[PDB]
Design an enzyme around this catalytic site. Structure first.
Site: not given
Ligand SMILES: Nc1nc2c(ncn2[C@@H]2O[C@H](COP(=O)(O)OP(=O)(O)O)[C@@H](O)[C@H]2O)c(=O)[nH]1
Ligand SMILES: C/C=C\C=C\[C@@H]1O[C@](O)([C@H](CC)C(=O)NC/C=C\C=C(/C)[C@@H](OC)[C@@H](C)[C@@H]2O[C@H](/C=C/C=C/C=C(\C)C(=O)c3c(O)cc[nH]c3=O)[C@H](O)[C@@H]2O)[C@H](O)[C@H](O)C1(C)C
Ligand SMILES: [Mg+2]
Ligand SMILES: [Mg+2]
Ligand SMILES: [Mg+2]
Ligand SMILES: [Mg+2]
Ligand SMILES: [Mg+2]
Ligand SMILES: [Mg+2]
Ligand SMILES: [Mg+2]
Ligand SMILES: [Mg+2]
Ligand SMILES: [Mg+2]
Ligand SMILES: [Mg+2]
Lengths: 371, 82, 205, 85
Positions: A21, A25, A62
């Site tokens: 998170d 992605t 995970h």
């Molecule tokens: N504010 C901000 N949020 C980010 C940034 N990069 C990612 N996010 C947050 O990360 C979330 C996406 O997470 P996701 O990739 O689906 O989770 P993962 O696959 O477990 O890494 C989005 O809702 C963004 O709000 C960033 O540079 N700035």
RNA sequence: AAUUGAAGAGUUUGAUCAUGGCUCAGAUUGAACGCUGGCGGCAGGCCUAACACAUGCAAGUCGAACGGUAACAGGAAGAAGCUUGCUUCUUUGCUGACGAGUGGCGGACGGGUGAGUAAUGUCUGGGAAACUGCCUGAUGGAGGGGGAUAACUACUGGAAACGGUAGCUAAUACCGCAUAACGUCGCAAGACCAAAGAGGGGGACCUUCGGGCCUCUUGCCAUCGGAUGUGCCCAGAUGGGAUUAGCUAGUAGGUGGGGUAACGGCUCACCUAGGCGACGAUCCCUAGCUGGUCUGAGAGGAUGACCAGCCACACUGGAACUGAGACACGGUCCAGACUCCUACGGGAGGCAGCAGUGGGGAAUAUUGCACAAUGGGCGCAAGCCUGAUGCAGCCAUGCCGCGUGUAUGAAGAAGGCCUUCGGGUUGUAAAGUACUUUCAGCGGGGAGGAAGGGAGUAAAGUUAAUACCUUUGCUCAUUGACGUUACCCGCAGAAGAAGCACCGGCUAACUCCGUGCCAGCAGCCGCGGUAAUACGGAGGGUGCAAGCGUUAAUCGGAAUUACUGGGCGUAAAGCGCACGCAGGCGGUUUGUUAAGUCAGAUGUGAAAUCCCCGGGCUCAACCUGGGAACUGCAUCUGAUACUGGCAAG
């Protein structure tokens, strides 16, 4: 299955195994969108850099998905540590880097999200120094690694600066990852990692070609758990694109004829006929150290039942040792005999992983085979 | 339409042709009316292998049987009336 | 699938003058040949019925080299034909090309004749054949091609041929390696070492 | 598809329209003849029969229902009219 | 020379006989499974879910019908960057060709599936009340017109499917007129009703100097017939059940109309109240039928694998049109389910075709090549295409053939096992010496499936004609996926190729070790309670062999549904008894009928398949020629002994 793929800009695999998170992605989607704009579960997206064509694997970060993540990283040729610059290193990130080092990922690139969420010019440098120190202390490269800061979700928002930054990120990714070595010398071999059932087409098996080439219409042999049988390939493809031959080192999906979804499971290998034969017991030398190499502390004894992870999957196995070793206390550089339930086609020099309780105990190299 | 044509009945790689009067609405291996004879392609050309009934052929042509290319070719191969 | 393996044990299983190997190396009753004397030697359990018939069929088949299915096909053809089923069966067995070569002498043993026929050391009417199951018709001629002339294989066979008697229907010259087959044999000339109607009873069963 | 069925379908529809029109006009002529017959007239019935004969015979010659069909109705109509005329 | 034809064994009991069932020894299959596995030839490959389908293809052709040109080979109408010979642009719609479109034909044929269907199906034998494009023969005609309408233009509703507007619009599309016979109606008289002309040579007759016209290739309008594919009707036969006895009133018939290409309740109005049914009506279950196939000596029993004929079907159901030929297998409309697409304005779909996928199952195929040969449809024709077909792939699924070698060698070694401890035994088995190299494998040569057709031409008909065309031959090139052809010739070496089942009696095969009613085998008899030739293992023998065993189904042995060919006192079996209808049979003699029966003759019993005589694939498997048979069916004539109809006793 409607695009005739050209074998130019040799395929290179890049995997994002960053923090949970923290934008893995979103980062890979942004990379794909910006590259396709300026150039015209494990998520296997692709993109054609002017230097090399890359397949990006977004792996699940995970802890419980480590089993498939092992193959995803062994599948992988270059790692991208995706982490937030506002939290720094995490226990999950440390576990991921330990797993990457244990599977043997040579090149790793660090990316720092949430650059604009911090209105300062010192915290970003502090967290970058912290992660660099972590890499340097956990047996990773140092000041000769491109470290990338920037926003992973604003790269898709209408901008120019972050688009240029992510383009520069892709550039040194392809620069820092040179032409990888391929092993198309021996006959064809492909470990299976996923099975799909195409209506009207049949069963297709996905995986990275370990060695050899596969021409359309070639006979291959399925060797693996409880079964050694034969089959025929028709319609070699890769990422829903038409292919003619399949080299080694790239993740492709081979179509098999006369394959049952429940009969063929993950763990088997598609080899050339008469090449390898499955075995249930084999001799191997272990490389466990005293205490600081994953191995436990207390001097355990015989009857140990660890999971022996291989190129594809794992299995619970038993170990027997020759006389001269009363205990099997950690510090086992000796050779022993390992017996497994599920037979897997193996060859001499194979490197496998010994794991238990969710942690790696030691490594092992196949020395001989006892069938 | 009613016509005289050849039907294949021999084994694989060793064909055998029978010349017969059959309506065109049927198939090659389909039904017919009256058998006329046979023409062996290999013909084992020491012994026989070509036997046609020109009297029956003429009788059916008189009634309206359309001669086929193969039948005419076989007739020209053997003789007009010998 | 021609039979292959031991031959002395095969012969002593029944105990007869079936035939022997072409080479001779102390072929006699030295100590134990077919009716082994001394401390043992039970030869015949003396089975009631159908056992002697099975033994006759087996000895006939192993002498002629024919398999059970082909032998039964020959029996069915003989029964379908006229005359006596046994003599028609014996006529077909002798008309088998391998036995023709063996009785002409070019085959030292029947197995050797089959080997030569397979290896194309034989020709019929000026045509090669590599089938030991070919049936020869009366008034025919079977020659040996020029390649098989230079075989110590054939030289020894023709040497051993003239130690036996000669048949009613074969006339062979070794100056050209050619033999004329004129007529078909009968039970009178055939060796009287077996019964045909018992075999007829067995497969009519 | 670009098969001949579509052209076959439209040709069949056009032929259906034409044949339906011709059959309907022939049926109306036959109905008028029958109405004249049943009304009790004897010269007008003959005139209607002589008027309907050419058109039905022409359509039969063109070949849209049947020559025997035309012959049978002509026979039935003449057998009806000649009884009273 | 074309059915010459038949096996039994074990088991009730302390033992016997009989009854009586059970089990086994044989073939055989669309077989499945386990083990094993070298090659080649032939054949076969969703029996279950007529369950649902991604995708690609299976029916287009004809410019010698037409208006046309989007093409573009473009010579050429013209021009040129003018590479020192032919290159480029609107291309003149202009040729060859061709996009669509009008038009003719097959897309009702090729192909697939047995769901439905107990007679409306099928086989056999009969008939009339009818049709028929393409194939034909004969008799005759092809005249002049008119008006439609597609393409195309532009406006423009829609993502597409498909559209409205005005004509351009041509014919072999359509519609009147000239007509009316051999045609239809009608007893005639009379009435009615027909076409289309296209392509080519151009002499020349004129010459719209193409054309009619000399003309050939044709095609078209009608009739009379043949052939053909049919539609209709009848008779016999073709499963089970009476724990299925009444069914039916458009139902039985008649009188007239309508309808059908023709008969007929096919339908309508009326009248008559019958018709079917104990030979099984009605109803329920099941089922494609036949030639054939398997098993049988035979009568019989099972079944409809491959192939052929017929029927029915195309998601389920209903309906109609075109078309000669359908209620249409890759035409149309609609109700229902399902699926898909949509811009949410609205559209598409039915693999029981070739393949292929999901599910089911004990279980069964490649999303190949080709029109090369035959055939199919179209066309002057070359020529188009054909998932028909032919070849290719996998599977030992079934049949056939070949190969793993041949003599050696007593050393009766090695090693395994047994032994009355001598020895035997696997065992001439191996090594060897001479080889052969079949067939695998490597390299070359290499028949045939190829008959045609096309380009030139010689001769004959056609016509001033040698124009033009057609027919009888001669020169020229071609016309194969199969196919690294079959095959043959060379190459090193046996070098590269054997398993399964059983071994106490049925049935062909004997010893040891260990367990000790335990573990365990089996079809039966029956084994296994320390000494198992029966269990597990080992040794050794036997039966088949690239195939062996288990299981699944039919018949046989089962004379155990018995008609040939059983029995009813005690094994199963005489109704508790009597009367009697339908029904079955029937004393003696004569005459007469030809029904049953017998004889002779005809047609027929499709082909295919069994069989006999032969032939070709190295013989065979396989294919094929001829013949017989298919015991059946109907018809014509005789026989009158028997049964029977009729007349007499
Ligand atoms: N504010 C901000 N949020 C980010 C940034 N990069 C990612 N996010 C947050 O990360 C979330 C996406 O997470 P996701 O990739 O689906 O989770 P993962 O696959 O477990 O890494 C989005 O809702 C963004 O709000 C960033 O540079 N700035
Ligand atoms: C991880 C499981 C799956 C791997 C799959 C297989 O791994 C492999 O078989 C592999 C064989 C090399 C394997 O068995 N790996 C799986 C198993 C064995 C693990 C391998 C490698 C190690 O060596 C003993 C490996 C960490 C090794 O340590 C060295 C340095 C130490 C690093 C520190 C971390 C460690 C441990 C640690 O305990 C530690 C610490 O000390 C301090 C703080 N905190 C810590 O947590 C160096 O960095 C080497 O890389 C092959 O890579 C195959 O290709 C593979 C991918 C199929
Ligand atoms: Mg079927
Ligand atoms: Mg009526
Ligand atoms: Mg049914
Ligand atoms: Mg379809
Ligand atoms: Mg019987
Ligand atoms: Mg019986
Ligand atoms: Mg009895
Ligand atoms: Mg009793
Ligand atoms: Mg009584
Ligand atoms: Mg009682």
């Amino acid at each position: 299955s409607k695009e005739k793929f050209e074998r130019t800009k040799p395929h290179v695999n890049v995997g994002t195994i960053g923090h949970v998170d923290h934008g893995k992605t979103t980062l890979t989607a942004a990379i794909t969108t910006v590259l396709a704009k300026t150039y015209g579960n494990t998520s296997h997206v692709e993109y054609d850099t002017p230097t090399r064509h890359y397949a990006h694997v977004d792996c699940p970060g995970h802890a419980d998905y480590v089993k498939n993540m092992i193959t995803g990283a062994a599948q992988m040729d270059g790692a991208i540590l995706v982490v937030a610059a506002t939290d720094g290193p995490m226990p999950q990130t440390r576990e991921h880097i330990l797993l990457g080092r244990q599977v043997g990922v040579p090149y790793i690139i660090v990316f720092l999200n949430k650059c604009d969420m911090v209105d300062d010019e010192e915290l970003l440098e502090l967290v970058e120094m912290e992660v660099r120190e972590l890499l340097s202390q956990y047996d990773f490269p140092g000041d000769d690694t491109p470290i990338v800061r920037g926003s992973a979700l604003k790269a898709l928002e209408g901008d120019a600066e972050w688009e240029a930054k992510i383009l520069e990120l892709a550039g040194f990714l392809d620069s820092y990852i040179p032409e990888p070595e391929r092993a198309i010398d021996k006959p064809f071999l492909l470990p299976i990692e996923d099975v799909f059932s195409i209506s009207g087409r049949g069963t297709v098996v996905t995986g990275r070609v370990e060695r050899g080439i596969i021409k359309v219409g070639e006979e291959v042999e399925i060797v693996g758990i409880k079964e050694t049988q034969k089959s025929t390939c028709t319609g070699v493809e890769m990422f829903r694109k038409l292919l003619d031959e399949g080299r080694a080192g790239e993740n492709v999906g081979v179509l098999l004829r006369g394959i049952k979804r429940e009969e063929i499971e993950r763990g088997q290998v598609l080899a050339k006929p008469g090449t390898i034969k499955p075995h249930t017991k084999f001799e191997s030398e272990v490389y466990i150290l005293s205490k600081d190499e994953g191995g436990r502390h207390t001097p355990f004894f015989k009857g140990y039942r660890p999971q022996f992870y291989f190129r594809t999957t794992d299995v619970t196995g038993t170990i027997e040792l020759p006389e001269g070793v009363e205990m099997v206390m950690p510090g086992d550089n000796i050779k022993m005999v390992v017996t497994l339930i599920h037979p897997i086609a193996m060859d001499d020099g194979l490197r496998f992983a010994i794991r238990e309780g969710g942690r790696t105990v030691g490594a092992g190299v196949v020395a001989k085979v006892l069938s | 339409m009613v016509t005289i044509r050849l039907a294949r009945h021999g084994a694989k790689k060793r064909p055998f042709y029978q010349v017969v009067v059959a309506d065109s609405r049927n198939a090659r291996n389909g039904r017919f009316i009256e058998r006329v004879g046979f023409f062996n392609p290999i013909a084992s050309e020491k012994e026989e292998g070509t036997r046609l009934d020109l009297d029956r052929i003429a009788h059916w042509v008189g009634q309206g049987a359309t001669i086929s290319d193969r039948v005419a070719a076989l007739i020209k191969e053997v003789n007009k009336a010998a | 699938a021609r039979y292959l393996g031991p031959k002395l044990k095969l012969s002593r299983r029944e105990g007869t003058d079936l035939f022997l190997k072409s080479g001779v190396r102390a072929i006699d009753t030295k100590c134990k040949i077919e009716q082994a004397p001394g401390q043992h030697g039970a030869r015949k359990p003396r089975l009631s019925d159908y056992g002697v018939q099975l033994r006759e069929k087996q000895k006939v088949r192993r002498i002629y080299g024919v398999l059970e299915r082909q032998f039964r096909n020959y029996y069915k053809e003989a029964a379908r034909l006229k005359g006596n089923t046994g003599e028609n069966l014996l006529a077909l067995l002798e008309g088998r090309l391998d036995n023709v070569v063996y009785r002409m002498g070019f085959g030292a043993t029947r197995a050797e004749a089959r080997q030569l026929v397979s290896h194309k050391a034989i020709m019929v009417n000026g045509r090669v054949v590599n089938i030991a199951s070919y049936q020869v018709s009366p008034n025919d001629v079977v020659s040996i091609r020029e390649k098989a002339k230079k075989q110590s294989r054939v030289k020894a066979a023709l040497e051993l041929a003239e130690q036996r008697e000669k048949p009613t229907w074969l006339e062979v010259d070794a100056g050209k390696m050619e033999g004329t087959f004129k007529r078909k044999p009968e039970r009178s000339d055939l060796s009287a070492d077996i019964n045909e109607h018992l075999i007829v009873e067995l497969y009519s069963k | 598809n670009i098969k001949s069925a579509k052209k076959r379908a439209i040709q069949s529809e056009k032929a259906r329209k034409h044949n339906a029109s011709r059959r309907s006009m022939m049926r109306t002529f036959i109905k008028k003849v029958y109405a004249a017959i049943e009304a009790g007239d004897k010269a007008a019935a003959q005139k209607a029969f002589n008027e309907m004969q050419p058109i039905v015979d022409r359509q039969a010659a063109k070949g849209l229902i049947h020559k025997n069909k035309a012959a049978r109705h002509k026979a039935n109509l003449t057998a009806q009219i000649n009884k009273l005329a």
